[PDB]
């Protein structure tokens, strides 16, 4: 079965499957279309599944895709553990600029549903972490947008102390207001 926990931000949900465990090992539906739609209240189609691997402390900057290319993302961690973050970047939203952070691990099997209109990011807490997620729309380079991980206006409280290992592009990410200039 799966427990659905609401977060401080309405549209952002934490999902916690409980697995059917036995001698072989375990089995669980990590996703079920019908179930998810009733749970979200709207039809939603995931067209792309991504899988990544990161070393401890690697933080994948805050990302999002603009307008029609915005991606809703249902993310989970298949190996290791990460601290996952969703930031509301809808200018007209009551929770604009607010963030939600959740520990997602292969062990706890938590998933975080991040609707279109949010920026996403995560840091690897384990030696290595393998991150999996489903997106409601296709990857579109021309639509990419980013926000610096430690932006003060959002003020995310990241679980680490050291400076994160960042990609060229995330280290050079704009601040919240700059990033959303034309949005």
Ligand X SMILES: CC(=O)O[C@H]1C[C@H](n2cc(C)c(=O)[nH]c2=O)O[C@@H]1COP(=O)(O)OP(=O)(O)Oc1ccccc1
CB burial readout 78-96, b (16+ within 10 A) else e: ebbbbbbbbbbbbeeeebb
- φ, ψ of residue 147 to 5 degrees: the values are -140, 135
Q: Is 4 exposed, middle or buried (0-12, 13-18, 19+ CB in 10 A)?
A: middle
Residue 31 interacting with a copy of itself (CB under 8 A):
yes
Among residues 92, 93, 83, 159, the alpha carbon closest in space to that of 120 is found at 83
Choice from 17, 59, 60, 83 touching ligand ATY (CB under 6 A): 60
Q: Which residues are annotated as a binding site?
A: 24, 29, 48-50, 60, 73, 120, 144, 169
Residue 84 interacting with ligand ATY (CB under 6 A):
no
Q: Give the residue closest to ligand ATY by C-beta.
A: 139
Contacting ligand X within 153-182 (CB under 6 A):
167, 169
Choice from 16, 18, 29, 37 touching ligand X (CB under 6 A): 29
Taking the complex as a whole, how short is the minimal distance between the CB of residue 89 and ligand ATY, in angstroms? Answer: 16
Cα separation of 47 and 51, whole Å? 14
Taking the complex as a whole, how short is the minimal distance between the CB of residue 173 and a copy of itself, in angstroms? Answer: 15
Choice from 3, 5, 10, 53 touching a copy of itself (CB under 8 A): 53
Instruction: Indicate if 133 belongs to the active site.
Output: yes
| 31: partner contacted, choices ligand X, ligand ATY, a copy of itself, none (Cβ within 5-8 A by kind) | a copy of itself
Contacting ligand X within 32-71 (CB under 6 A):
50
CB burial readout 98-132, b (16+ within 10 A) else e: bbbbbebbbeebbbbbbbbbbbbbbbbbbeebbbb
Which residues are catalytic, by number?
63, 133
Binding site for ligand X (CB under 6 A): 20, 22, 27, 29, 50, 139, 167, 169
């Amino acid at each position: 079965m799966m427990i659905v926990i609401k977060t401080a931000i309405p549209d952002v949900l934490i999902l916690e499957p409980k697995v059917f465990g036995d001698e072989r090992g375990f089995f669980f539906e990590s996703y079920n279309q019908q179930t998810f739609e009733e749970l979200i209240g709207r039809k939603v189609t995931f067209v792309q599944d991504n899988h990544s691997k990161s070393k401890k402390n690697v933080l994948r900057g805050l990302h999002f895709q603009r307008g029609e290319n915005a991606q809703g993302k249902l993310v989970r961690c298949a190996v290791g553990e990460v601290f996952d973050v969703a930031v509301d970047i809808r200018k007209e939203s009551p929770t604009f600029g607010q963030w939600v952070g959740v520990n997602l691990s292969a062990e706890n099997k938590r998933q975080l549903w991040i609707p279109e209109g949010f920026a996403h990011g995560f840091v690897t807490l384990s030696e290595y972490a393998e991150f999996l997620y489903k997106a409601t729309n296709y990857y579109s380079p021309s639509s990419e947008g980013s926000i610096l991980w430690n932006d003060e206006a959002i003020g995310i409280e990241w679980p680490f102390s050291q400076l994160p290992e960042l990609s060229a592009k995330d280290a050079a990410a704009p601040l919240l207001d700059q990033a959303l200039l034309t949005e």
